[PDB]
Design a protein around this motif. Structure first.
Motif, short mmCIF file in Angstrom:
data_model
loop_
_atom_site.label_atom_id
_atom_site.label_comp_id
_atom_site.label_asym_id
_atom_site.label_seq_id
_atom_site.Cartn_x
_atom_site.Cartn_y
_atom_site.Cartn_z
N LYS A 1 4.66 2.96 6.39
CA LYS A 1 5.24 4.29 6.28
C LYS A 1 4.18 5.36 6.48
CE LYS A 1 6.42 6.18 2.44
NZ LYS A 1 5.61 7.36 2.86
N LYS A 2 3.05 5.25 5.78
CA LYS A 2 1.99 6.24 5.93
C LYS A 2 1.45 6.24 7.36
CE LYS A 2 1.73 7.48 1.50
NZ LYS A 2 0.49 7.14 0.75
N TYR B 1 -5.35 2.34 2.31
CA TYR B 1 -4.21 2.97 1.67
C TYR B 1 -4.01 2.38 0.29
CZ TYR B 1 -3.41 3.45 6.71
OH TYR B 1 -3.56 3.65 8.06
N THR C 1 4.28 0.56 2.39
CA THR C 1 3.67 1.87 2.21
C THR C 1 2.67 2.16 3.32
OG1 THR C 1 3.95 1.62 -0.18
CG2 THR C 1 2.45 3.35 0.60
N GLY D 1 -1.12 1.10 -2.27
CA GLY D 1 0.25 0.61 -2.22
C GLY D 1 0.35 -0.75 -1.57
#
Ligand SMILES: Nc1ncnc2c1ncn2[C@@H]1O[C@H](COP(=O)(O)OP(=O)(O)OP(=O)(O)O)[C@@H](O)[C@H]1O
Ligand SMILES: Nc1ncnc2c1ncn2[C@@H]1O[C@H](COP(=O)(O)OP(=O)(O)OP(=O)(O)O)[C@@H](O)[C@H]1O
Ligand SMILES: [K+]
Ligand SMILES: [K+]
Ligand SMILES: [K+]
Ligand SMILES: [K+]
Ligand SMILES: [K+]
Ligand SMILES: [K+]
Ligand SMILES: [K+]
Ligand SMILES: [K+]
Ligand SMILES: [K+]
Ligand SMILES: [K+]
Ligand SMILES: [K+]
Ligand SMILES: [K+]
Ligand SMILES: [K+]
Ligand SMILES: [K+]
Ligand SMILES: [K+]
Ligand SMILES: [K+]
Ligand SMILES: [K+]
Ligand SMILES: [K+]
Ligand SMILES: [K+]
Ligand SMILES: [K+]
Ligand SMILES: [K+]
Ligand SMILES: [K+]
Ligand SMILES: [K+]
Ligand SMILES: [K+]
Ligand SMILES: [K+]
Ligand SMILES: [K+]
Ligand SMILES: [K+]
Ligand SMILES: [K+]
Ligand SMILES: [K+]
Ligand SMILES: [K+]
Ligand SMILES: [K+]
Ligand SMILES: [K+]
Ligand SMILES: [K+]
Ligand SMILES: [K+]
Ligand SMILES: [K+]
Ligand SMILES: [K+]
Ligand SMILES: [Mg+2]
Ligand SMILES: [Mg+2]
Ligand SMILES: [Mg+2]
Ligand SMILES: [Mg+2]
Ligand SMILES: [Mg+2]
Ligand SMILES: [Mg+2]
Ligand SMILES: [Mg+2]
Ligand SMILES: [Mg+2]
Ligand SMILES: [Mg+2]
Ligand SMILES: [Mg+2]
Ligand SMILES: [Mg+2]
Ligand SMILES: [Mg+2]
Ligand SMILES: [Mg+2]
Ligand SMILES: [Mg+2]
Ligand SMILES: [Mg+2]
Ligand SMILES: [Mg+2]
Ligand SMILES: [Mg+2]
Ligand SMILES: [Mg+2]
Ligand SMILES: [Mg+2]
Ligand SMILES: [Mg+2]
Ligand SMILES: [Mg+2]
Ligand SMILES: [Mg+2]
Ligand SMILES: [Mg+2]
Ligand SMILES: [Mg+2]
Ligand SMILES: [Mg+2]
Ligand SMILES: [Mg+2]
Ligand SMILES: [Mg+2]
Ligand SMILES: [Mg+2]
Ligand SMILES: [Mg+2]
Ligand SMILES: [Mg+2]
Ligand SMILES: [Mg+2]
Ligand SMILES: [Zn+2]
Lengths: 534, 48
Positions: free
Chosen positions: A247-248, A238, A244, A240
RNA sequence: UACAUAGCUGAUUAGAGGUAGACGCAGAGAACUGAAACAUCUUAGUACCUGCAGGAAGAGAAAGAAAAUUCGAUUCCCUGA
RNA sequence: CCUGAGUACGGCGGAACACGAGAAAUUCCGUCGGAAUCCGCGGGGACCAUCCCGCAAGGCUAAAUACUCCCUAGUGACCG
RNA sequence: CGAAGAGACGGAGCCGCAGCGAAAGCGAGUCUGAAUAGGGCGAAUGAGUAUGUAGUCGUAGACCCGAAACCAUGUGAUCUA
RNA sequence: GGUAGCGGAGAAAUUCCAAACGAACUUGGAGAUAGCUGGUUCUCUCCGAAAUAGCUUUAGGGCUAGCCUCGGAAUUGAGAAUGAUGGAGGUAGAGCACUGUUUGGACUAGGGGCCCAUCUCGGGUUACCGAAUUCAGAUAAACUCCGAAUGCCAUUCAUUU
RNA sequence: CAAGCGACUGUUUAUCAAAAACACAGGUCUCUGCAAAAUCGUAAGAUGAAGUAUAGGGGCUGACGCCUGCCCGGUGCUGGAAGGUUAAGAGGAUGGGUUAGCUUCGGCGAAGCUCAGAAUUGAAGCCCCAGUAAACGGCGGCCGUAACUAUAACGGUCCUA
RNA sequence: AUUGAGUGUUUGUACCACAUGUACAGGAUAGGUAGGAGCCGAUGAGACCGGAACGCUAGUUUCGGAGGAGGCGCUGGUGGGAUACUACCCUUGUGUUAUGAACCCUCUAACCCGCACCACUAAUCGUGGUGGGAGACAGUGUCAGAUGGGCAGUUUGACUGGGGCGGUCGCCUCCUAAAAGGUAACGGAGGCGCCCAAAGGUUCCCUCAGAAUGGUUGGAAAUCAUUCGAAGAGUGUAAAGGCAGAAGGGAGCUUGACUGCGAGACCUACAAGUCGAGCAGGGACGAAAGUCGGGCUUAGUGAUCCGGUGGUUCCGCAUGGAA
RNA sequence: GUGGUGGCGAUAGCGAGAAGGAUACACCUGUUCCCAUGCCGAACACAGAAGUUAAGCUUCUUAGCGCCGAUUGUAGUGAAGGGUUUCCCUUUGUGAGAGUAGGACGUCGCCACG
RNA sequence: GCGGGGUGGAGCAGUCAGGUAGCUCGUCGGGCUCAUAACCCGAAGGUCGUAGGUUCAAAUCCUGCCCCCGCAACCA
RNA sequence: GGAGGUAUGACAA
């Protein structure tokens, strides 16, 4: 750094299955995963120590600086200076070069061509690693982490866990690498030392992969986060920070869960009609016909129905004392101790624990915290004073460096106790995420995090009423740390704990803190921060 | 989980033998002294 | 709309249709059928439609065939098979 | 100094080559990109080197070949 | 060339005279194999070829008659909507 | 006068589109295909089946084998029938020695209620239920201590063929 | 005299059905800002309309009267669009083939050509979020309980949009 | 692609200007390398004063004022590196230009106008002209994704005491099966789609299940002892056949659950399936004889086409390679 | 006679009883030796000769059990027929199992010590 | 024959994905109240229908068997 | 001071 179709299976338990990852250059990648996920194994693939059963792992030609999760002490008598000097190949080449000169005298006209080429490369290689480093290293300690020169002449094995981490981190920097592979670079560091590491890694211009279970530490550095999944045996990358990624990830698993729900409803719908036709009268030809037609659709559905990945199970700890604590579990009176040849750590140390008390031994790296705990157990005999345990007090010790495990034996053999039968041992090891034949694995092949669970299991199986814990959350994944802290909070016994993790101490709810080296038995409070500042 | 395996010759790397093992009972690679038809001699063979 | 151009008038010039229900070239292009079913494939580039032909058409004078060392535009027949 | 450029060729999509994209050369169509030029260019069945053979992107050309509505003279182990 | 004939010319080509091997290749052998072994296929242990004629088969409608249908040009709203 | 079949039109019925419209008519591809039904024309002579196995989107089709026919080659005669001899095989029958099913008798651990004694602890009984044992008697496609007749395989065998 | 069905006049299976079927006025939903949507057509050109939202197309209902409840989880439609996934194209890091040249049988290997090619970029759609039922559709179980009995207004619990 | 101008904003790249270089030691802020005994200055030097930037706080750099002529380096010690100055440059952060791009909007000459006026001209066609609108979009070509019963070509088993429903489909064992073999039914019963690193090989050794009797916890029954006990056990997994001269059980060493094969048989329509002495290579166990090419035996499986991976003294479309 | 080692279907066995050791075979005496016990010198292994025939073992007696088992009759059945034909019957050949008369407490070798 | 079910007094989880038997109401004992309801605090009540397997260990996985409930047990 | 306005509880006694 790139890997394609990665496969790796140690025996019956697999690590990577058709995993892939591409890391662009100049990416500060934060590697995250539960204990055993395979984070350390990835570096071993990059370092070519391991070979994938199938697939290709691609690494750039640049020189790599590797910071191992465990300190590599080849010999017990190695000095700190010898350990650091081994970072650079200056000494190794000179020993080879010195032999080359010997061969030149012995051999006249036979091997000269080969020897001359070898001599030339060594000189050119030696100059590339400029031999002026002898002075640079001496001052790299000063500017890096305020590493005193007295340690510089001391055996490395005698250093404290925090001190060793500083030396190992400095050794990596001393090598002057091009890519940084840091495996838990702040495992034992205190708050002050962590600040320097963070700033250097923020400033570091090159690529740096960091394996860390410290979310706050990573968030300040990481720009790309690589998650090693334990259940899917895959790698996802990912852009970030840690939040993040969470969250993703949480959204993706939510969207996957909803997909499997709707596929199950459609299967149930067909199934419900197939059954209705199946139990109808044989005289209802059309319904029987439709039932078989839907049986074909039902079969095709059940064959394209995605399986929900089994959610990785979290640790369950239920620590209870067999006996009851007294009002005076431990009596320490006028205890002085010094390691032969070194300054006295404390003089006339006297404290008294109360029972069912959360006692925190605060301090900084190399201040005597682990020495004090070793003193209570009996590993160190006090130079002066007495240490008295009430006959009602049973003690369980969690050492800092995981020195209570037999690397040669298996997990089950390590936990073997006279007081527990076989199925009882297996049940608790399953609560610590050692399932079935995972307990027959040798302790030598486990990761530091998995070993920490075995040590914790030994502490739990004692059912002691006094817990001497030296940095318990070290090596544990962030989820397991919170479980550890919450369960200790409910422990109905006395806890002598050492921890540089601010979150863990808050969960336990400390009562009294003992500051070092300035002996100060104090009530626990946010004044802990005041002592840290001073 | 009983699986089919190949026993390669550790000397010449010829994949000489087809056999099978239970991975649960034999996690590590099966090693046997088997005759290598290429080298025409008994050589250590290891699962690959 | 300025010069022009378009339009317009005349002259000049040449096409306009039909076939031999054949043969040629080109455009466009099926299906039954075979595959013991059937979508690739096959029937076929066939039938049909349309254009252009010519007594024939098309091809044709190497940016070729080769590698026995060489042959020397194209077309068609035998063979290669 | 000249010797055929938006050409050769390439990507993409189709087609023709006995050859169904195939390892697919050779030829062509649509679309987009797009050379060299004699110290050059093309082919020898992916491709490269070497060697050999040729000289595209201009045109024309009899004969050997196909067919017979008709015309003339005939033929038939063809009809009756 | 010759009567829409026989025939003559035409040796290109085709079958047979050697097999074995995927093939390089070796050859009364050859392939497999480390093998002078064993075994496979061959030789030992020879008859072919051209044409006629008949039996059967294959490609063609292929012993004859028969669908419902499919496809492609055309013709029909003088019935009926 | 307009709308035409890969269509039109339909106050809608698969309704109409030249006396049969789930898709007109005509010509062509075209001798479509038809593992289906029907038909297939002179004579005599010799021989003469099969309706089975295996496999099959296979079951009223096909393929190889079996059975018929014609020709040919060749051997210490390899075929058939009968006899003798030697073998394999567990059926008929029979038996119970195993395994199931089962009858009666004797005796019985144990099992049901009653009283005395109750800490529910030890007895005495229905000719109360009865394991197992034993005596006698049955039973069997998937039982067998046994076991035919026949059939079968074989013989440098014998006789006929 | 009375009941069903359809409001009504109409329409239909030319040639076995005239009806309760179709149509209908009325209702409602929805599309359509005009080169309208919709339809015929490759296109040009038309219808819609020489009309313009009180108009035109489409779905359903079917005079009139009284009315039309609950469910937006699913499927469609409408809107959203931060994130995930996603084509061609663009981009080409690296890896193969070839070979001037290097070379200690090795092998190494510039350029050019050439065979593959990852990162990165890349729309709608999909996943998601909300709305919408005169859109498609869907509108539950078991147990207990009252001054006789029966039932059970009442209670429990599960399941569902 | 047709498809052309700009602006602005954010970005990729390359030069070009500028500025940055303080480890410790050391004159003190030596970034690398090479050249270097000379270099700079009334083309107004050092020093002085003030502004500004950096900053590791030591200082470094730059601008201006006044003044008017001198300074720096080599030599010297420190250090891995020694200094002026030049060149080639590398880190660091500011700007300018060359700019590749994404967006932003604007523009106008393409393109479009089922808008108006004008002409051709009888014309609500068309083509030109002029204004207005729109505008590099749209439309159209090529390519690509999505959607797409609107439409099209098709598929949508068989067995079966009719067809349907249900059941069945390959393999193993038994009964049926009529004492060789074979033998049907939607006849009667069960199993298989594996397992085992020993539960394989060999050498050596061993003999079971139950029952009676005695015996702490201990019970019908866990372990122990004697006696009886021919198999009433076990043989991984169904059944049948077999095995206690073991094929059952234990132990040591092992990997023959070998390679090349293979006279001869069984089975059989074919394809397959089954057994196999023996020969050679190299072995395991054993003193030797000898046994061993998996397992008490018989299920544990799937043709070809097409692909993957490994090996290879095979081929390589002119030749060497490659494909 | 005894001890080895074999062939023959237990007619060779089993149970019970009796006798014997001169040799031989065994019990037997030990764990120093090779070797050994998932513990035990019980076993296996080795060394040994005080005692004993008590057991095994040999020989002898017994058929109580097990085993072997003729003849006769019967069941079944090949072939040829028949009827009153799921069955049954006749003729011709074949012929069990059962149950019995009976047999049998072994026989035929080779080697060694007597 | 096709499905669904057996876990404390009742109704439900846990069962897919093996380790540790719960939730809802109710019952009982004690509180609170003049008393009852509501409420508060304590306790009890199942080795998961039953018997074999698999495993280190099963409520869970496998198999059988007995119970209870909705269907079906025949079509022109 | 005054006035219009902003949960349950037999029956008799
Ligand atoms: N065996 C030893 N021998 C000599 N010196 C020692 C030894 N052990 C520790 N020391 C010294 O004792 C000092 C402190 O001891 P200790 O191990 O308790 O540190 P600490 O409190 O655990 O620090 P941290 O855990 O954060 O690293 C260290 O400086 C260390 O160098
Ligand atoms: N030789 C091995 N044999 C068997 N299992 C292994 C072996 N090596 C690794 N494993 C397993 O690989 C798994 C993952 O590897 P790895 O050690 O890299 O995990 P990790 O994420 O780095 O651990 P942690 O984060 O706690 O430090 C471990 O659980 C470990 O048990
Ligand atoms: K003609
Ligand atoms: K077709
Ligand atoms: K067919
Ligand atoms: K011509
Ligand atoms: K091609
Ligand atoms: K060529
Ligand atoms: K040429
Ligand atoms: K041969
Ligand atoms: K040979
Ligand atoms: K002849
Ligand atoms: K012939
Ligand atoms: K024909
Ligand atoms: K024919
Ligand atoms: K009309
Ligand atoms: K009509
Ligand atoms: K024949
Ligand atoms: K019996
Ligand atoms: K029988
Ligand atoms: K009506
Ligand atoms: K009406
Ligand atoms: K009504
Ligand atoms: K009427
Ligand atoms: K109607
Ligand atoms: K209404
Ligand atoms: K309407
Ligand atoms: K509706
Ligand atoms: K209406
Ligand atoms: K809804
Ligand atoms: K919805
Ligand atoms: K290259
Ligand atoms: K455009
Ligand atoms: K019938
Ligand atoms: K063994
Ligand atoms: K002894
Ligand atoms: K004796
Ligand atoms: K006897
Ligand atoms: Mg790790
Ligand atoms: Mg410590
Ligand atoms: Mg066909
Ligand atoms: Mg083709
Ligand atoms: Mg070309
Ligand atoms: Mg092109
Ligand atoms: Mg030439
Ligand atoms: Mg000509
Ligand atoms: Mg017409
Ligand atoms: Mg008309
Ligand atoms: Mg109808
Ligand atoms: Mg009509
Ligand atoms: Mg045809
Ligand atoms: Mg006859
Ligand atoms: Mg019988
Ligand atoms: Mg009406
Ligand atoms: Mg009427
Ligand atoms: Mg009618
Ligand atoms: Mg009528
Ligand atoms: Mg209606
Ligand atoms: Mg219009
Ligand atoms: Mg269709
Ligand atoms: Mg078709
Ligand atoms: Mg059928
Ligand atoms: Mg039936
Ligand atoms: Mg028979
Ligand atoms: Mg038989
Ligand atoms: Mg066995
Ligand atoms: Mg070549
Ligand atoms: Mg070539
Ligand atoms: Mg008898
Ligand atoms: Zn080898």
């Amino acid at each position: 750094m790139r890997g394609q179709k990665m496969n790796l299976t140690f025996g019956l338990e697999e690590v990577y299955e058709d995993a892939e990852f591409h890391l662009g250059d100049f990416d500060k990648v934060g590697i995250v995963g539960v204990n055993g996920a395979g984070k350390t194994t990835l570096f071993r693939l990059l370092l070519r120590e391991l070979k994938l059963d199938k697939g290709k792992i691609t690494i750039g030609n640049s020189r790599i600086g590797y910071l191992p999760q465990e300190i590599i002490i080849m010999d017990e008598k190695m000095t700190v200076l010898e350990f650091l000097a081994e970072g650079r190949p200056i000494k190794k080449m000179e020993t080879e070069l010195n032999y080359i000169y010997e061969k030149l005298t012995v051999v006249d006209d036979d091997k000269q061509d080969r020897l001359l080429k070898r001599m030339g490369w060594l000189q050119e290689q030696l100059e590339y690693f400029d031999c002026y480093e002898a002075e640079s290293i001496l001052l790299d300690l000063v500017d890096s982490m305020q590493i005193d020169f007295d340690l510089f002449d001391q055996p490395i094995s005698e250093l404290s866990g925090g001190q060793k981490s500083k030396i190992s981190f400095a050794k990596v920097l001393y090598s002057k690498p091009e890519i940084l592979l840091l495996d838990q670079p702040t495992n034992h560091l205190d708050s002050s030392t962590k600040e320097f590491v963070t700033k250097y890694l923020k400033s570091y211009r090159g690529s740096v992969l960091i394996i860390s279970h410290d979310i706050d530490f990573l968030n300040q550095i990481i720009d790309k986060i690589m998650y090693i999944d334990k259940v899917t045996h895959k790698i996802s990358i990912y852009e970030g920070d840690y939040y993040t990624y969470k969250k993703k990830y949480s959204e993706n698993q939510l969207l996957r869960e909803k997909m499997i729900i709707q596929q199950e409803k459609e299967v149930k719908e067909l199934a419900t009609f197939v059954q209705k036709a199946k139990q109808a009268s044989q005289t209802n030809h059309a319904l029987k016909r439709m039932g078989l037609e839907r049986a074909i659709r039902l079969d095709k559905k059940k064959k394209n129905l995605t399986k929900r990945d089994k959610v990785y199970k979290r640790v369950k700890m239920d620590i209870k004392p067999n006996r009851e604590v007294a009002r005076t579990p431990l009596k320490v009176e006028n205890v002085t101790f010094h390691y032969p040849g070194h300054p006295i750590l404390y003089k006339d140390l006297s404290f008294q624990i109360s029972g069912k008390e959360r006692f925190l031994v605060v301090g900084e790296n190399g201040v005597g915290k682990s020495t004090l705990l070793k003193l209570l157990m009996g590993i160190n005999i006090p130079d002066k004073g007495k240490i008295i345990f009430n006959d009602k007090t049973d003690v369980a010790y969690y050492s800092q460096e995981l020195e209570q495990l037999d690397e040669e034996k298996t997990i089950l053999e390590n936990v073997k106790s006279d007081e527990y039968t076989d199925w009882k041992l297996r049940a608790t090891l399953s609560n610590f995420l050692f399932y079935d034949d995972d307990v027959n694995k040798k302790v030598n092949v486990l990761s530091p995090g998995e070993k920490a669970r075995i040590v914790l299991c030994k502490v739990l199986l004692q059912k002691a009423n006094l817990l001497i814990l030296d940095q318990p959350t070290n090596h544990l994944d962030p989820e397991t740390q919170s479980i550890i802290g919450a369960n200790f909070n409910l422990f109905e016994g006395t806890i002598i704990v050492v921890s540089h993790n601010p979150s863990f101490v808050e969960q336990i709810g400390i009562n009294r803190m003992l500051i070092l080296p300035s002996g100060n038995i104090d009530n626990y409070s946010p004044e802990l921060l005041e002592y840290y500042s001073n | 989980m009983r699986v089919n395996i190949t026993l390669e010759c550790t000397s010449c790397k010829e994949r000489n033998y087809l056999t099978n093992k239970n991975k649960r009972n034999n996690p590590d690679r099966l090693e046997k002294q088997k005759y290598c038809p290429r080298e025409r001699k008994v050589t250590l063979h290891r699962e690959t």
